[PDB]
Every structure is written in structure tokens, then in C-alpha cells.
Design a protein around this ligand. Sequence first.
Ligand SMILES: [Au+]
Ligand SMILES: [Au+]
Ligand SMILES: [Au+]
Ligand SMILES: [Au+]
Ligand SMILES: [Au+]
Ligand SMILES: [Au+]
Ligand SMILES: [Au+]
Ligand SMILES: [Au+]
Ligand SMILES: [Cl-]
Ligand SMILES: [Cl-]
Ligand SMILES: [Cl-]
Ligand SMILES: [Cl-]
Lengths: 173, 173, 173, 173
Amino acid sequence: SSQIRQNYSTEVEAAVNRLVNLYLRASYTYLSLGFYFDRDDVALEGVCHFFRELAEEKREGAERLLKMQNQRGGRALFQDLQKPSQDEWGTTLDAMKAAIVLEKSLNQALLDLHALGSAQADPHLCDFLESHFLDEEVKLIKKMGDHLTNIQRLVGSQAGLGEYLFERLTLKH
Amino acid sequence: SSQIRQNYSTEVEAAVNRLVNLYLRASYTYLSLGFYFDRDDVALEGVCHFFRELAEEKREGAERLLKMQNQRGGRALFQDLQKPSQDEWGTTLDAMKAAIVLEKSLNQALLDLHALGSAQADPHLCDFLESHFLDEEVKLIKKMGDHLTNIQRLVGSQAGLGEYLFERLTLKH
Amino acid sequence: SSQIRQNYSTEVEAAVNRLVNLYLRASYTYLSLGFYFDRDDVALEGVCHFFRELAEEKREGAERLLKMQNQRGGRALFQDLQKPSQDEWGTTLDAMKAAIVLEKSLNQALLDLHALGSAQADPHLCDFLESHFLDEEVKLIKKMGDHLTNIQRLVGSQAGLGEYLFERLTLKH
Amino acid sequence: SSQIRQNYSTEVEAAVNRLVNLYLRASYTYLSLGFYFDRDDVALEGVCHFFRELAEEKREGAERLLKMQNQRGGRALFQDLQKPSQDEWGTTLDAMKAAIVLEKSLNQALLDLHALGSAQADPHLCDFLESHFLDEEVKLIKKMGDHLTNIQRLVGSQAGLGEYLFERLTLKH
Ligand SMILES: [Au+]
Ligand SMILES: [Au+]
Ligand SMILES: [Au+]
Ligand SMILES: [Au+]
Ligand SMILES: [Au+]
Ligand SMILES: [Au+]
Ligand SMILES: [Au+]
Ligand SMILES: [Au+]
Ligand SMILES: [Cl-]
Ligand SMILES: [Cl-]
Ligand SMILES: [Cl-]
Ligand SMILES: [Cl-]
């Protein structure tokens, strides 16, 4: 074991590596979501940009986890990254629903890792998650819920119109 | 009685304290309106900001009344503040209707206080209301009436769409 | 329940609403304290400003709690706001003693809410309180204790003089 | 009568001339107060400056009244100006008490003139007083009441000390 490793359980080390895998999986999902909305037959630029920005954010979360793994003396271990759950993502509504599902799973993984840290008496892990992840996730899930509400209200009887208007007047382009 | 008190009736002093209570009540109503429109399942940011800004304005009106009470040698007396009339505020249309009702009640209270001042020959009170409150209220009620008209025109057959469009293109975000 | 709500107990949701009520109550107390020290027959400008600034700070705490309630998918519920415990606040010493009592009650409410969060395994709630409230309160209570000490030392045999000097040379005007 | 005079009673015209006399009398009182506090055996610079600034303010009030008299087509008529009520003004407390008495008499004269204007249906006179005099007077009398309170609290058992401290730490020099 590391010359620097102190109070860092094998259990947390392994759960960190698994979380890295989740975040990179999530990043890959968002890359696929982003490019789907760039297809000439979908063509919702603001939706594409919203998902591409999330791909970067999730990559950044993984890189923060990997940096922390090294700072504690754990050993990064990478696994295969499973492709995203879908090749085509339907409407903006369908996509935002899938994104909120994905975020809830990340959030629950964070909470599970926090509980493990608390059981292992690892306050540096708890702090790290509280400072860099738990609020970021709460804020993002709230944003998504606000978006889902506005998208749903816009469906009405003219779905196409509502999807265009949401892209143009809420999402950034 | 105060070493400074001059031409300031007990009646006006008491009516000032009651008006302070009304303004603070109104402020609290607007705080509740503002946060309702911030719920993930309402999510009309511009509507939230319109009501939150009014919460501040009504607080400011109360503070101006309290400052004036002290300048005339009256004694501020605070009472309990009743909660707002509703916990949920319905649509933007429902909310704007409730706001205009509330403003009309404030306006009538101002006018009643002006009439009392006139009956008591208290020109400083009359001036104070004319200068800091009566036009502010007339302008606000007109703005609200303009908003109600535009919201109502937007309901048509596609209410959800109309509510989104009003938030996006009239209200500020 | 919310589409966004995750790991957020009904118990915490309700305790958050109660804390909002406490903070708004505290804000109202400070508004009354502030205006009392603005009376022509009290006239301690720096004491008035100290309490008015606290009224704003406590309002801000309530608004942060309400924002957080919405971000977690809870539902803000407002109750009646009880008036402050006194109509007249005595000397600067009396007022600062009442303020420290009030702050200790807020602090204890925060700690009680933190313990509930810990019992419910809600690390986002714990973080939120630790980051935005617990140190703010500790720092404020320390400031108050420092003020009480200086005010008490100034009473001596010339109370009036001491109260003037504290207002002029410690409090800001 | 003037080619311009319209709705301007002889009664208001005469009461305006009398008010001019009062304001100039008040100005002269403040000049005497100011120079008394400049005596080598009084030597309270900040008290001198407070009263000298008021001498100017009251002169300015008279000049505004005279300008208004001309704008309405009335004819300024000057009378003898009686000297101030005292040659020596005692302590800062004595002086501030005399000043508040003087201001109350000016205020009552303003209110009496407003009532006359109202009885004569002269809204321009009412406006003029409301806009340029009634609030200025209320604010000044409040300032004076605040000063009297602080001076009185400072007397205690060490009057000399209290008078020095009030001059140094409240009044400007
Ligand atoms: Au923990
Ligand atoms: Au921990
Ligand atoms: Au009036
Ligand atoms: Au009046
Ligand atoms: Au905790
Ligand atoms: Au916790
Ligand atoms: Au009038
Ligand atoms: Au009039
Ligand atoms: Cl797969
Ligand atoms: Cl009620
Ligand atoms: Cl009560
Ligand atoms: Cl004489």
C-alpha cells in the first residue's frame, strides 16, 4: 500500500473506481444525446448544446474522482465503458426524461458512496462528495425538473411548435 | 407624548401601524407567490422574479411608513402577521388576479388613510402618501391590468403555450 | 411527490418549513429592534443600523431555506408570523441580551435540524446547513458576546455616557 | 392688481409676508446661537457650525417664500426684524431646547398657512408648502429631538465631559 495512504478503505477505493465508470458512462450517454439532436432530421441546436455541455461536466466529475483517488493513495482501475442505452432519443421530452433518470442514478451512487464513507469514518471522502458533487447534482436535477415541466406544458395540441419554442426561448444557441 | 410630536393625531398614528401590517402581509403574500412559481412543477422563472421583486417593494413601503411614524413622534407597534390566503396559486392568470385584488386593497387603505389625514388636517401625512405611495400604486395596478389582458389573450385554446410565452416574452429572466 | 425528490424525508421537509418561520420571526424582531433605536427618545443610530442589518440577514436565511426546499422537491408552507416578544427594548444592553437569546434559539434549531438530517442520512441537508448557516451563526453569536462585554464594561457609574460611547465608537453610522 | 395674479387671496399674500418675517427672525436667532458657541469661553465648534448652517437654511426658506410671492403676483412687504430672544444661550442642551421651540413655531406657522390655503382653495400654495417646507421641518425637528436625547443622556454626573463628547462625536468639525 501507498506511503501516503491513511484512513482510506479498500471498500471506498473500489467504490470510487466504480463511480468513475458511472460518470464516464454518463458522459458517453450525453455525447450520444448531443449528437442525436445535431442530426439534420432532428436539428434542435439548443438541445444538442445542453447535452454536450453535460457530457463535459460528467467527464470533469470523473477526472475529479480520479485525482482524489490518487491524492488518497488508491489506485485507479478502469473498466470497459458500456454504450448508451439508446441509439435514437426521441423527442426533447423523451431525452430530458432519460437524462433525469440518469442523474438520479448518479445521485443515488453518490449518496451510497457518502453512506459508505460515513460507515468507514472517512470524513475527507464525505467532505469531497459534499463539496464537489452533492449540490451540483441537486441543482442539475432541479433544472431538469423545471425543463420537463416547461416542455410538457408546451406539448398541448401542437407538439412540433412546442419543441421548437422550448429550444429557441429556453435553451441557448 | 413625544418632545417632537406636532399635529399628529392618535388616529393617524394607529392607522399608520395598521398599514404597516397590511404592507408586511402583502410582502409575505408575494414571497409565497414567488416561491410557488419556482417549484419544479410550476417553473416559471419570470413569474417568480416578478413576485419576488414585489415582496421587496412592499417591505420597502412598510419601512418607509415606519420611518415616517418615528419622524412624527408616533410609536411603531407590530402585530402578528397572518399567513397568505393560499398555499398554491394556480396559474399565472390566477396569481395575477390575486395580486391585483391585493393591490386594490392596499390602494383603498392608502386612500382611507389620506381621507383620515385630510379630516385631521395633517398635510404632512397627505403629502407623504401622495409623494411615495399613491402614484406607485396606480402605476402598479395599471401594469397588472396590462399583464392580465395579455395573459388572457394568450389562453386561447392552448393555455400551456400561452403561459410559457408570456413568461418568456413579457416577464424578465 | 416531486419528479425530482430524492432522499428527502417528509420530516426534514416539515422542519425546514418551521425553520423558515423562525428565521422570518427573527427578521421581524430585528425590524422592531431597529426602529425602536430610531425613536427620537432613544436615538442610537448605530444600534438601529446593527439591528436593521440583522433583519435583512435573517430574511436572507429564510429565502435560502425556501430556495433549498424547492431544489429538493419539498413544498414551502407558510404560517402566521408571531409578533416580537416586546414593543419597547430598553437599553442597548437589554437589546443585545435579547438578541443573543434569539440567536442561540436559531442556532439550536439549526443543530436540531442537522441532527435530524444525520438521523435521516441526508448529507445534502447537512452540507447545506454547515456551509450557509452554522458558521454564520457561531460568528454572529461571538460578535454579540464581544458587544455585550464592551457594553457592560461601559455601564460603570455613568450608564448614559457608556451607551453613547459604545454607539459612537463601536457601532457604524 | 397684477396682470399675472390668479386665485391668490390678499389673505395668503399677507400671511406669506408674515412668514417671511418669521423665517428671517429665525435666521437671525441662529446667527446669534452660532456666534455664541464661537466665543472663547464657550468654544464648541461643532455647535457653532450646526447653528450657522441653520441660519442659512432659514434665510433660504425666506428667499423661496419671496420668490413664490413674486411668481403669484403678490407684493413682498418687509417689516422690522426683532432681535433674538436671548443674548447668551447657556449650554448645548439649553440651546437645542430653544431651537426646537423655534422650529415648532415655524412648523405651526406653516400648518396655519396650509390651512388658510386650503380654506381659500389655493392648491398651488398647498403644494408649495408640502413640497419645500413641511417635510424639511419634520425632518429637522426629528434630528433635534434625537440630538436632545443624546445630549441629555450625556449630562449624567459629568456635564462638561458630556458636552465636549457630543460636540466631538455627533456634531461636524
Ligand atoms: Au459522512
Ligand atoms: Au464521513
Ligand atoms: Au389631504
Ligand atoms: Au391633508
Ligand atoms: Au450529518
Ligand atoms: Au447528514
Ligand atoms: Au390644501
Ligand atoms: Au389647497
Ligand atoms: Cl451495454
Ligand atoms: Cl390567516
Ligand atoms: Cl405572539
Ligand atoms: Cl424684540
